[PDB]
Design a protein around this ligand. Structure first.
Ligand SMILES: [Mg+2]
Lengths: 83, 124, 208, 71, 99, 138
RNA sequence: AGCUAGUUGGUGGGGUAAUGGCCCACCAAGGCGACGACGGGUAGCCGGUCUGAGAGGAUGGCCGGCCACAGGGGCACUGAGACACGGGCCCCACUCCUACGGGAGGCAGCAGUUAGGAAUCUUCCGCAAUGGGCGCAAGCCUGACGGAGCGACGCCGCUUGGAGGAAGAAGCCCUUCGGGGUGUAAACUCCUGAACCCGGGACGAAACCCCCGACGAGGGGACUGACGGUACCGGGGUAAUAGCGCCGGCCAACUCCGUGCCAGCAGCCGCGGUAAUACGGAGGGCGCGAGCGUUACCCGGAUUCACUGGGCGUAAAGGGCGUGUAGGCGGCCUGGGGCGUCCCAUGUGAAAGACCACGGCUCAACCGUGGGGGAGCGUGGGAUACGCUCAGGCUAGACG
């Protein structure tokens, strides 16, 4: 399954996540196809979420299923706003 | 030589000769000893220096120098070897470690102790 | 950690008076004035002409001593300077001065660099609102350095402030005495600093 | 520190070995590699196989010594 | 695109098959010298069409045999012993210098 | 075998410089002539022309030296201090435009064989093209 | 130094998701090779890591990719996918029970035990985050992972106080007996208040779920913390671990006593055989510092394998010469081609790292964002000065 998912990139206690296009059966850290967004849960930054929306949309169109958290993030960013 | 020549032939990569067959690149090798024999130095030097002939965990049968003004070393005493060439003594490539295993520290060695494995002066 | 211990001995060794005690290091008492010779059993013996390397090393030590710094830290700073664009010399000096403790000292929030460092450690010093407790801190242009509210009413700090009421602040710094503040205006250059040291020598020593 | 165990036993010279070294049959017991002492070297002293000489012996190797006493 | 090569027909001693010596002219990475290195390539001739001494155009292909991965696309220049002949001489020499 | 012509020419020039001679003949070539022209433009030589020693095309290289210097070793200062064939037969050196050497840090020059003709280093840079690094002159 | 007989190619077939000597029948006798095969050794490879001015060199830990193997070997089956790490069959090797016929195994998963060994961790808690799999879903499963524990194992941060304080206590150590050192160091005064106790106290966690809305978008809601009562803040609050190397030269730093070529130090030159700035100790110093040194290894320095950048009359080194094969290399002029070569454009060069900028953790390490580079390689075009290559000429080389 082609998936939009997160990947741990940071450190112990300070996590950082890459919103990403990859196959299901990789490492969560694995050689992913495309970097589309990034997430800081600790909102330490004024910009904690920014995703390239168009790319994400394209991915979705192709067949990429977002993960629960990933999906939520995308929603927050506004990739589903069909208006 | 010439460029063409070089391409034909190749540059001989200088391989470094192992100074120490303590084997494997084992920084320390433990071993059981045979004899505590004292041997004479070289040509401008004269003394009687303390050498232990060691069977090693590497399976080497090498000659190792004992540092230390007063030593305790015996036959089947279990020893550790660090290496380091002794300039006067031939056959010797090895320093026995003091203050470990069965090469106990020099008594009242109280200046450059770290080399000899002798504990801090227990001051009171 | 830090040097810790007999300070003016170092000064004596180096030959140039250094202001690590702050005061007394101003009084006829830094031992430098009536005792110029280096510490030890061989102070009043003929000092043999100093070697190329040796002089450089001395210089390095002097500079390091000035800032009360671990050698490793100094090395790191040097490396950083080297990495960065421009004259490795002046930039290095700026970086050294950019240290929080040094900044505190040169704002006359303390008499001693050591004192300043101590103050920084124990939570007496505010930088732009947030109190920082690590003397290594990088102060950069347009940054404000204040005395803590818990610390404003402290005796020592008050004394220091009084001492600095009229006492000169650097052409890169601008302190508020009565609001107990201190703005950083410019990166402290070689020209700005009367440092009794030659950084070129240090650089030479280090490039090995 | 000096280990005081530097043994001072006497001996009949037995053999001319090369390079100022001498088999010296001890009066106590065995023959040992017994090189000439530095002092002796300094003051000439040609030792001959057939002299009474005193050897400085290590207890770690009592088969190796150093002639201290000429004649 | 599928790989295009230029070489010399060196052998016709096989059925439906021809041998092609590609010569390649390239710099040494370390020494900075142009070295005429080469390789042989076993090529498919669906006709027995091409003859010894022929300069040919070689295309990368779907495999036809193990160690046979190329079809000859087209003939470029026909008949030049000189280049073949060097190779032959080399081969002969290989026989000699030995024990 | 007169194996490299450019190199030979360079050598001849060097020799001439060493002995303070006004001129050497070199065997003729278009390439050689072009190189000479470039040198002249730069300022290393008084100039050149084609002449016929034994009815064979040859090229005069008119030499250039400094003033009669004072003291021991009074001999004039050499205009060309050094010249060196770099892209030798068998040793064909080739540079990209970012890899053209600043020969003597903007004082000496290097002579380049390129698409846009036989040209100097600065000129090459200007015309943003690399090539065969024939020779260095300082 | 030659190697090859399913070996190299063919026809026809099998077998495969598919090509193919993968296999099989038959025919042909090739195929590779010194432009280094086969044979032996060594070895996972790389993105990289260190070093280095760079070119290079070594190495491939962790992290990322791929390969390859799951006691050793062989084989299939099933399935989209395996010749199948915690599936199967079979043999060997091995441990375990056996009512002797036979079965059970596989930690190169986490943890740990044992062994080897210089040397390497807790039979830790959790499904909270991320991710995985199943499932409508709840939810389960999860030694992936999150974290804590141990080890200064590395890097980074901080503390072992600061301000005063003698023309200079004591103690220790030199001394030319006057003095000098340790050293403003201490002691003592002032000030702060790591430790430490109490008070609170997380970010990380908003979704999946419910309902409005069509189960779409959108909106409101609730559950949910291993780390962890930790980070961190608020109050009080004690001056509160300094160690190691060296001290002849390199190389920073000198005196005294003991010792007497001995005991010893040493990485090299070497010091020591009675006045040792090289030994043991003591002061003094100097360098680092919660580390410091030793050893092992690698690079450097070694421009000591030299491409950048070595040489070869005598130092190592011109083969005894000749002819000659491959190979390398090549005069002048004209034209094409444009392979080299150069150039532009773009594709690619994943991320992480390494560079620059900013941002976050009290700084930094560490990490996040953004950007550039980037050797090399592909594709399209261009350029012909220079190699190459074809074609023609020339007489300065060569040959007659
Ligand atoms: Mg003795």
């Amino acid at each position: 399954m082609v998936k939009i998912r997160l990947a741990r990139f940071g450190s112990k206690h300070n996590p950082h996540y890459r919103i990403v296009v990859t196959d299901a059966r990789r490492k969560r850290d694995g050689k992913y196809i495309e970097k589309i967004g990034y997430y800081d849960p600790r909102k330490t930054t004024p910009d904690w979420l920014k995703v390239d929306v168009e790319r994400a949309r394209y991915w979705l169109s192709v067949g990429a299923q977002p993960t629960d958290t990933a999906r939520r993030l995308l929603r927050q960013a506004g990739v589903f706003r069909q208006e | 030589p010439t460029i063409n020549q070089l391409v034909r032939k190749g540059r001989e990569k200088v391989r470094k000769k192992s100074k120490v067959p303590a084997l494997k690149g084992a920084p320390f090798r433990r071993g059981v000893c045979t004899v505590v024999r004292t041997v004479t130095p070289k040509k401008p030097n004269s003394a009687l220096r303390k050498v232990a002939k060691v069977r090693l965990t590497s399976g080497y049968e090498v000659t190792a120098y004992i540092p230390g003004e007063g030593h305790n070393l015996q036959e089947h005493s279990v020893v550790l070897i660090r290496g380091g060439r002794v300039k006067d003594l031939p056959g010797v490539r090895y320093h026995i470690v003091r203050g470990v295993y069965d090469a106990a520290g020099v008594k009242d060695r109280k200046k450059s102790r770290s080399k000899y494995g002798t504990k801090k002066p227990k001051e009171a | 950690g830090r040097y810790i211990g007999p300070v003016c001995r170092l000064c004596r060794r180096e030959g140039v008076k250094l202001y690590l005690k702050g005061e007394r290091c101003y009084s006829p008492k830094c031992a430098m004035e009536r005792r110029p010779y280096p510490p030890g059993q061989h102070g009043q013996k003929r000092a043999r002409r100093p070697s190329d390397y040796a002089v450089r090393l001395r210089e390095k030590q002097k500079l390091r001593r000035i800032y009360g710094i671990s050698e490793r830290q100094f090395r790191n700073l040097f490396e950083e300077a080297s990495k960065k664009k421009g004259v490795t010399g002046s930039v290095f000096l700026g970086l050294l001065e950019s240290r929080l403790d040094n900044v505190v000292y040169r704002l006359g929030f303390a008499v001693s660099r050591r004192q300043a460092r101590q103050l920084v450690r124990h939570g007496h010093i505010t930088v732009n609102g947030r109190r920082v407790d690590l003397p290594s801190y990088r102060v950069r242009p347009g940054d404000e350095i204040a005395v803590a509210e818990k610390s404003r009413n402290l005796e020592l700090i008050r004394q220091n402030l009084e001492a600095m009421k009229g006492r000169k602040v650097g052409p890169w710094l601008s302190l508020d005495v009565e609001g107990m503040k201190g703005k950083f205006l410019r990166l402290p250059d070689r020209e700005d600093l009367a440092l009794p040291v030659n950084e070129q020598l240090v650089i030479e020593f280090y490039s090995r | 520190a000096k280990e005081k165990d530097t043994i001072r036993t006497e001996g009949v010279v037995t053999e001319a070995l090369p390079n100022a070294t001498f088999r010296v049959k001890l009066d106590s017991g065995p023959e040992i590699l017994a090189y000439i002492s530095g002092k002796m070297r300094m003051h000439y002293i040609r030792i001959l196989p057939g002299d009474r000489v005193v050897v400085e012996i290590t207890p770690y190797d009592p088969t190796r010594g150093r002639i201290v006493y000429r004649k | 695109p599928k790989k295009v090569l230029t070489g010399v027909v060196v052998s016709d001693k096989m059925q439906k098959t021809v041998t092609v010596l590609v010569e390649r002219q390239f710099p040494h990475p370390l020494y900075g010298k142009v070295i005429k290195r080469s390789k042989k390539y076993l090529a498919h001739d669906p006709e027995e069409k091409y003859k010894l001494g022929d300069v040919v155009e070689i295309i990368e292909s779907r495999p036809i045999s193990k160690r046979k991965r190329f079809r000859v696309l087209r003939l470029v220049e026909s008949g030049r012993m000189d280049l073949v002949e060097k190779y032959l001489i080399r081969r002969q020499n290989y026989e000699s210098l030995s024990k | 075998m007169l194996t490299d012509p450019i190199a030979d020419m360079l050598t001849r020039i060097r020799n001439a410089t060493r002995v303070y001679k006004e001129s050497t003949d070199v065997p003729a070539s278009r390439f050689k002539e072009e190189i000479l022209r470039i040198l002249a433009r730069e300022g290393f030589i008084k100039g050149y022309e084609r002449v016929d020693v034994d009815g064979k095309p040859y090229l005069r290289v008119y030499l250039k030296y400094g003033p009669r210097r004072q003291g021991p070793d009074p001999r004039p200062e050499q205009v060309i201090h050094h010249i060196r064939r770099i892209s030798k037969p068998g040793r064909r050196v080739y540079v990209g435009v970012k890899e053209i050497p600043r020969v003597r840090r903007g004082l000496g020059i290097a002579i380049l064989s390129t698409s846009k003709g036989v040209l100097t280093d600065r000129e090459a840079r200007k015309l943003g093209v690399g090539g065969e690094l024939i020779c260095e002159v300082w």
